[PDB]
């Protein structure tokens, strides 16, 4: 599926909504066709690969056991309750699949708040015992680079992969194992509404003239002050981001944000 | 050479989510089928007790392929529960983002999920690009030259000669395959358009972020309307309009012509993958409280009787669990829904999926583009009729041909073309409404302590409904009934096969090691397993 030449990537889907895979398809300069034809070798990816069934399982084994090595990109949390049965692929639990494959990777990237921290299915009461990759697989010494967000900015995945290929090492990581080059600043310190925040100029409701005028969304729940991400800087789809669309940040690159940041419209 | 015995396809790739298909084959034709969804997350359990305003943020994470659709369904549901009538502009903006979602979703489905079932990418290397260019130029107003297609061929050649086939590794067409019919030149045209569609979809998705903050997972809806005051500006409207215009041109000039050339080459596929019953909820309202105000109207059809479309009665929905991994066997209306997981392994106690089995008046119902198109057609929808009739005339087939795998694939394109034109109509109405001096986008509302609500979306895969019971101002019950749950859920307690199971009966399988015919039918429903199970 690979050999020499382009670095092999094995992309795994655990408990996920496929929003992170879709985010990668929005890659811009480089675009996803350049990434899959020129930069990397995408050797397993259930959303877009041609093979299915046994043929797909074969492609995966071929990629994972390659003497050339592979990088694993992991989307989705790992359900661990009831011995992992809430999530299976090819009738193997996702916990077993990841336990077997990820220790063999040259590097692992957890892409997605679900993969990094457990995500939406880990929110209380977590019926499937979902865990982020490093939590689930700590005992196997897996230390994935965490690229958080729901979904993350694909700029952040490509930037991390390019760095890794250049330098042969992870970039500086924060205490949640996220690259500081992307997660080093709060959304809030980068926000265009910060002068209103400083002045105590808050929109009291979404229908208000203050909201129309672009006042700060803190009283409507904005979690920008407690969220690390590069959203106001890079934006999404080369054009917008939540506060510039008038809606508070919901904290989506932070661990446990479904429970920590809720109710989303209170601070 | 004909095979008798089981075939298992696990994972089914080029879908969203985790699906296991099991069939029994006899003498080369499918005799029995099971649709097994193998991931559960339990979002309905997680929502209990929470603030109803928070539901749309959680339920949007049901699915990032059909992103936005669940935020819209939950927001419609909570809007309904609290009795708010959102401003006209909120309806326009929500509707426009949804139309843009359909275009993005269907273009990526045809090229990036479905087409590798029908296109041999490696045979494109043998093509004559000059011949190919003539063919491409004869099916579209867009002129393609030999040089254009040679660039694609040269890029592919370099990719293939590297030995690293990537996403094409072990593809069912490698080495040739008797069920793959296209000539090298048509393979080359489709492959060129596959690649082009990877960059076009960026633009299609960007249209949603212009008003909706970001894609995937938009962030502009609230109970009572939308938040995006910038969406009123001429600059943002123009930016949207330019992306829409480019997206529509790709639909009209690239996707539909490709769809017709492939369909003409696989006309035998009018003989497989039919279904009996159809349900659709309608979409693109003028009045948030009246489904019959939608540009596509709701309806129900049993046993292909399109002369007798039945009204949609939302109280006739029940979700079965007898063949699902939940407690017991009792079917429930979603305002009395239960989500009580209990795993028994594959076929343990005759249960084999994490999806519930929705039934309408006890019947299994196909939903999605074929339901929306056939029901609209039969309602006299003039745009759906004009496009459907042209497609059938081009293909030289009768309407009966639509009841098939090919027909459903064609219906996905028909709906894409119709919605792409209708987005322009909605955009003009939106512009006209602003010009009248209406700049309001959100209305005030109050949370009741006790209420019931339901929100209906016809999503790219069909009829989506979110159902809430509010108790003490919190979520007492929240149930999602999702289009893939209808189409790909398992059998019910009357043991009736679901639409996907039933549609697979009679599928020919030329080569059991490479069962592309099963994939063609399964993919034609555009399965979304994160959606179906949640
Ligand atoms: S991080 Fe968010 S977008 Fe990504 S798989 Fe999880 S729920 Fe979906
Ligand atoms: S809108 Fe949010 S991120 Fe911006 S200044 Fe206010 S609290 Fe900070
Ligand atoms: S919700 Fe997420 S996408 Fe950015 S603005 Fe807040 S971290
Ligand atoms: Mg449900």
Cα separation of A237 and A31, whole Å? 12
3-class SS letters over B271-321: CCCCCCCEEECCECCCCCCCHHHCCECCEEECCCCCCCCECCCHHHEEEEC
Q: Which residues of A touch B441 (CB under 8 A)?
A: 207
| Ligand closest in space to the Cα of B45 | 4
Q: Which residues of B touch A242 (CB under 8 A)?
A: 213-214, 219
For chain A, domains (ranges, CATH) are 3-182 (3.40.50.700), 183-267 (4.10.480.10)
Is B404 catalytic? The answer is: no
Specify which residues B462 forms β-bridges with: B459
- B217 in contact with A, Cβ within 8 Å: yes
Q: Which residues of A touch B209 (CB under 8 A)?
A: 236-237, 239-240
- Using N-to-C axis directions, what is the helix angle for B405-435 and B382-395, rounded to 10°? 150
- Which of A41, A51, A120 minimises the CB distance to B58? A120
User: How far is the centre of ligand 3, averaged over its atoms, from the C-alpha of A80 (Å)?
Assistant: 27
Paired tokens of A101:
């494959």
Paired tokens of B463:
């009829």
* Nearest residue to B493 via CA among B364, B370, B393, B367: B364
Per the residue annotation, which of B228, B442, B492, B531 is the catalytic one? B531
Specify which residues A10 forms β-bridges with: A44, A72
* Residue B330 burial by Cβ neighbours in a 10 Å radius (0-12, 13-18, 19+): middle
The atom of ligand 1 lying closest to the CA of A19 is: 3
Peptide bond into A125 cis (omega under 30): yes
The answer to whether the Cα torsion of B179, B185, B191, B196 is positive or negative is negative
Is B492 catalytic? The answer is: no
Specify which residues B317 forms β-bridges with: B360
C-beta of A119 in contact with ligand 1 (< 6 A): yes
3 state SS of B340: coil
Site from B7, B8, B61 to mutate, A interface, most A CB atoms within 10 angstroms: B61
Cα separation of B528 and B482, whole Å? 9
Cα separation of B53 and B64, whole Å? 20
Strand pairing of B317-320 and B357-360?
Answer: antiparallel
- Chain centroid to CA A153: 8
3 state SS of A70: strand
C-beta atoms surrounding B77 within 10 Å:
28
C-beta of A253 in contact with ligand 3 (< 6 A): yes
- Which of B166, B217, B343 minimises the CB distance to A41? B166
- Long-range contacts: A201-205, Cβ < 8 Å, 24+? A205/B442, A205/B444
- Chain centroid to CA A10: 16
User: How far is the centre of ligand 3, averaged over its atoms, from the C-alpha of A149 (Å)?
Assistant: 7
Cα separation of A232 and B139, whole Å? 44
Beta carbons of A237 and B214 less than 8 angstroms apart: yes
- Chain centroid to CA B246: 22
C-beta of A16 in contact with ligand 1 (< 6 A): yes
Is B442 catalytic? The answer is: no
User: How far is the centre of ligand 3, averaged over its atoms, from the C-alpha of B94 (Å)?
Assistant: 20
Q: Which of A187, A216, A250 to mutate to test the pocket of ligand 2 (most atoms within 8 A of CB)?
A: A216
Cα separation of B26 and B385, whole Å? 39
Between A and B, how many CB-CB pairs are < 8 A? 289
Q: What are phi and psi of A27, to 5 degrees?
A: -50, 135
| DSSP code at position A251 | -
Min Cα separation B134/chain A (Å):
25
**Which residue has 């028909």 as its token pair?**
B414
User: How far is the centre of ligand 2, averaged over its atoms, from the C-alpha of A224 (Å)?
Assistant: 5
Could you give the C-alpha distances from A71 to A9, A20, A103, A131, in angstroms and in order? 5, 17, 11, 21
Q: What are phi and psi of B78, to 5 degrees?
A: -75, -35
Q: What are phi and psi of B394, to 5 degrees?
A: -60, -45
Task: Show the DSSP H helices in B162-218 as ranges.
Answer: 184-212
Strand pairing of A8-13 and A70-75?
Answer: parallel
C-beta atoms surrounding B19 within 10 Å:
30
C-beta of A122 in contact with ligand 3 (< 6 A): no
Q: How many CA atoms lie within 13 A of A149 on its CB side?
A: 34
Hey, whose CA ends up nearest to atom 8 of ligand 2? A188
Cα separation of A179 and B357, whole Å? 44
Beta carbons of B171 and B224 less than 8 angstroms apart: no
C-beta of A226 in contact with ligand 2 (< 6 A): no
Cα separation of B360 and A140, whole Å? 48
C-beta of A258 in contact with ligand 2 (< 6 A): no
Beta carbons of B121 and B187 less than 8 angstroms apart: yes
Q: Which residues of B touch A124 (CB under 8 A)?
A: 46
Cα separation of B264 and B391, whole Å? 11
Cα separation of B258 and B186, whole Å? 9
Cα separation of B301 and A146, whole Å? 49
Peptide bond into B11 cis (omega under 30): yes
Min Cα separation B267/chain A (Å):
22
Beta carbons of B315 and B333 less than 8 angstroms apart: yes
Cα separation of B3 and B27, whole Å? 5
Cα separation of B359 and A231, whole Å? 43
- Which of A13, A53, A237 minimises the CB distance to B215? A237
Paired tokens of B488:
């790909």
Q: Which of A118, A120, A133 to mutate to test the pocket of ligand 1 (most atoms within 8 A of CB)?
A: A120
Looking at chain A, which residue has its C-alpha nearest residue B442? A207
User: How far is the centre of ligand 1, averaged over its atoms, from the C-alpha of B361 (Å)?
Assistant: 35
Which helix (H) or strand (E) segment holds residue B101: the answer is helix B88-108
Q: What are phi and psi of A74, to 5 degrees?
A: -120, 125
Cα separation of B336 and B265, whole Å? 48
| Structure's resolution in angstroms | 1.5
- Chain centroid to CA A175: 16
Task: Show the DSSP H helices in B380-458 as ranges.
Answer: 382-395, 405-435
Question: Do B20 and A91 lie within an 8 Å CB cutoff?
Answer: yes
Question: Do B217 and A151 lie within an 8 Å CB cutoff?
Answer: yes
Min Cα separation B315/chain A (Å):
29
Cα separation of B98 and B4, whole Å? 45
For chain B, domains (ranges, CATH) are 1-534 (1.10.645.10)
Could you give the C-alpha distances from B302 to B95, B130, B286, B484, in angstroms and in order? 29, 49, 28, 19
Which helix (H) or strand (E) segment holds residue A13: the answer is strand A8-13
Q: Which residues of B touch A28 (CB under 8 A)?
A: 202
């Amino acid at each position: 599926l690979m050999g020499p030449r382009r670095p092999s990537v094995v992309y795994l889907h655990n408990a996920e909504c496929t929003g992170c895979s879709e985010s990668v398809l929005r890659a811009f300069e480089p675009y996803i066709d350049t990434l899959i034809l020129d930069t990397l070798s995408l050797d397993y990816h259930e959303t877009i690969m041609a093979a299915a069934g046994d043929a797909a399982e074969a492609a995966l084994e071929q990629a994972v056991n390659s003497p050339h090595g592979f990088i694993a990109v992991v989307e989705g949390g790992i359900p661990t309750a009831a011995n992992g049965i809430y999530g299976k692929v090819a009738n193997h639990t996702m916990l077993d699949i990841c336990s077997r494959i990820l220790p063999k990777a040259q590097a692992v990237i957890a892409y997605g708040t679900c993969a990094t921290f457990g995500g939406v299915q880990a929110a209380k009461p977590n019926p499937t015992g979902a865990k982020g990759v490093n939590d689930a697989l700590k005992h196997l010494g897996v230390k994935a680079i965490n690229i958080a967000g729901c979904p993350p900015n694909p700029y952040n995945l490509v930037g991390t992969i390019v760095y890794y290929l250049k330098n042969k090492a992870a970039p500086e990581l924060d205490s949640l194992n996220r690259p500081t080059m992307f997660f080093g600043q709060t959304v809030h310190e980068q926000c265009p509404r910060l002068p209103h925040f400083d002045a105590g100029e808050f929109a009291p409701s979404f229908e208000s003239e203050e909201a129309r005028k672009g006042w700060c969304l803190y009283e409507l729940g904005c979690k920008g002050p407690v969220t690390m991400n590069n959203c106001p800087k890079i934006k999404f789809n080369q054009t917008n981001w939540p506060v510039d669309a008038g809606h508070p940040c919901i904290g989506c690159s932070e661990p446990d944000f479904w429970d920590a940041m809720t109710p989303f419209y209170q601070n | 050479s004909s095979y008798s015995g089981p075939i298992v396809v696990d994972p089914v790739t080029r879908i969203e989510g985790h699906l296991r298909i099991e069939v029994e084959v006899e003498n080369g034709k499918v005799k029995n089928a099971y649709s097994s969804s193998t991931l559960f997350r339990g979002l309905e359990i997680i929502l209990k007790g929470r603030d109803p305003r928070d539901a749309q943020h959680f339920t949007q994470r049901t699915c990032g392929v059909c992103t936005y659709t669940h935020a819209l369904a939950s927001t419609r549901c909570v809007d309904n529960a609290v009795g708010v009538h959102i401003p006209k502009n909120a309806t326009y903006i929500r509707n426009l983002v949804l139309g843009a979602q359909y275009l993005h979703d269907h273009i990526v489905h045809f090229y990036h999920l479905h087409a590798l079932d029908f296109v041999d990418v490696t045979a494109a290397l043998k093509a004559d690009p000059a011949k190919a260019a003539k063919v491409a130029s004869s099916i579209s107003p867009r002129k393609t030259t030999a040089a254009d297609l040679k660039a694609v061929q040269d890029k592919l050649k370099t990719f293939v000669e590297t030995g690293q086939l990537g996403p094409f590794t072990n593809a069912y067409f490698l080495g040739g395959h008797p069920a793959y019919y296209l000539d090298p030149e048509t393979n080359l045209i489709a492959t060129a358009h596959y690649l082009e569609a990877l960059r076009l979809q960026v633009k299609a998705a960007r249209a949603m972020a212009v008003f909706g903050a970001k894609n995937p997972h938009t962030q502009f809806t609230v109970v009572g309307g939308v938040t995006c005051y910038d969406a009123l500006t001429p600059q943002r409207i123009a930016e949207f309009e330019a992306l829409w215009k480019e997206t529509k041109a790709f639909v009209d000039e690239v996707y539909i012509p490709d769809l017709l050339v492939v369909a003409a080459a696989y006309k035998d596929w009018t003989q497989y993958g039919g279904t009996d019953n159809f349900i659709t909820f309608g979409e693109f309202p003028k009045d948030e409280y009246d489904l019959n105000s939608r540009f596509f109207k709701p309806g129900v059809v049993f046993k292909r009787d399109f002369k007798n479309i039945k009204p949609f009665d939302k109280m006739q929905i029940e979700e079965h669990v007898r063949h699902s991994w939940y407690e017991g066997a009792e079917a429930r209306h979603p305002w009395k829904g239960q989500t009580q997981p209990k795993y028994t392994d594959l076929h343990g106690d005759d249960r084999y999926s994490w999806m519930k089995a929705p039934r309408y008046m006890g019947e299994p119902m196909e939903t999605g583009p074929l339901a929306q198109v056939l029901i609209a057609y039969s309602q006299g929808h003039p745009k759906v009729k004009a496009v459907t009739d042209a497609v059938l005339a081009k293909l030289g087939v009768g309407p009966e041909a639509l009841f098939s795998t090919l027909g459903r694939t064609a219906a996905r394109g028909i709906e894409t073309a119709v919605i792409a034109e209708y987005v322009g109509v909605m955009l003009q109405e939106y512009k006209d409404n602003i010009a009248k001096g209406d700049n309001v986008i959100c209305a005030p509302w109050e949370m009741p302590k006790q209420a019931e609500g339901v929100g209906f979306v016809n999503a790219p895969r069909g009829g989506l409904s979110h159902w809430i019971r509010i108790e003490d101002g919190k979520i007492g019950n929240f149930q999602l009934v999702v289009p893939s749950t209808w189409t790909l859920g398992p059998r019910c307690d009357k043991n009736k096969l679901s639409p996907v199971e039933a549609s697979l009966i009679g599928t020919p399988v030329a080569d059991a090691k490479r069962p592309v015919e099963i994939l063609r039918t399964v993919h034609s429903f555009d399965p979304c397993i994160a959606c179906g199970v949640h």
